[PDB]
From a paper:
The human [name] ([name]) is a key regulator of chromosome segregation during mitosis, through its essential biological functions in chromosome condensation, cohesin dissociation from chromosomes, mitotic entry, centrosome maturation, kinetochore function, spindle assembly, and exit from mitosis. The [name] recognizes phospho (p)Ser/Thr protein substrates for the kinase catalytic activity of PLKs12. Intriguingly, recent crystallographic studies have identified a hydrophobic pocket within the human [name] [name], located adjacent to the phosphosubstrate binding groove, which may regulate substrate recognition. Seven hydrophobic amino acid residues line the pocket; whilst V415, L478, and F482 cover the bottom of the pocket, the Tyr residues Y417, Y421, Y481 and Y485, form its sides.
The pocket is evident only in certain structural conformers, suggesting that it may adopt an open conformation in which it could accommodate residues from [name] substrates, or alternatively, a closed conformation precluding such interactions. The proximity of the Tyr pocket to the phosphosubstrate binding groove, and its ability to adopt an open conformation, suggest that it may assist in the recognition of [name] substrates that contain hydrophobic side chains, enabling substrate discrimination.
Author numbering:
A (entry chain C): 401, 368 to 371
B (entry chain A): 373 to 595
The structure:
């Protein structure tokens, strides 16, 4: 649900 | 711009760049074609609210589920709101425009989350200087497949971020250019016509074939 952490 | 992008992709893919007798990929590089804007970060809350994103100039935007868009400029105060029907209004955060407080609150939430936790794609890269008058692009549409998220910006750019290896393509139809960010986070920009002349490695050629398929999907789902 999100881009790379 | 999508139709142009499609033709440019047909052209490079048809030249079969990874099969060149001698591939001279570096000869097709052109740092002058680096984008002005790309998506550096994103959060998919599309189950309830929508998709939030940060552009490389540190501005953020949201494409809400109700088809509206809210953009916060990098001054952290100036807002543009785009209604379903395309009407655009300029506002400020500090004015507290009551009917928008829920959307403003969500955008701030997304912004803080991206800022605290997520890597900036193309962090090393200075964006090309654009004209100061040009409007900030916003997210026109997006979708995810099993292998990538596809982000289509209103200035015509299409960006494809691959899940498995964190590689990314940013296609710019206005310059007929592509930027490829590889698995080591090295950033290379190529002119598509030069890729036709000089060829490229199998990894880039494969991703350019997938890009054509994605631009066809965008064109098939348009409005």
């Amino acid at each position: 649900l999100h881009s790379t952490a | 711009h999508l139709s142009d992008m499609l033709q440019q992709l047909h052209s490079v893919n048809a030249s079969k760049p990874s099969e060149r007798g001698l591939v001279r990929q570096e000869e097709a590089e052109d740092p002058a074609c680096i984008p002005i804007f790309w998506v550096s970060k994103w959060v998919d809350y599309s189950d309830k609210y929508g998709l939030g994103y940060q552009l490389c100039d540190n501005s953020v935007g949201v494409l809400f589920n109700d088809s509206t868009r809210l953009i916060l400029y990098n001054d952290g105060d100036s807002l543009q709101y785009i209604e379903r029907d395309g009407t655009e209004s300029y506002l400020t955060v500090s004015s507290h425009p009551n009917s928008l407080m829920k959307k403003i609150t969500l955008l701030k939430y997304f912004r803080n989350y991206m800022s605290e936790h997520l890597l900036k794609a193309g962090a090393n890269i200075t964006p090309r200087e654009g004209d100061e008058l040009a409007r900030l692009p916003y997210l026109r549409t997006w979708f995810r497949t099993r292998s990538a998220i596809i982000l289509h910006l209103s200035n015509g750019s299409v960006q494809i971020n691959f899940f498995q290896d964190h590689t990314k393509l940013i296609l710019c139809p206005l310059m007929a250019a592509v930027t490829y960010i590889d698995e080591k986070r090295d950033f290379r920009t190529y002119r598509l016509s030069l890729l036709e002349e000089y060829g490229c490695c199998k990894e880039l050629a494969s991703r350019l074939r997938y890009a054509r398929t994605m631009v066809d999907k965008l064109l098939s789902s348009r409005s």
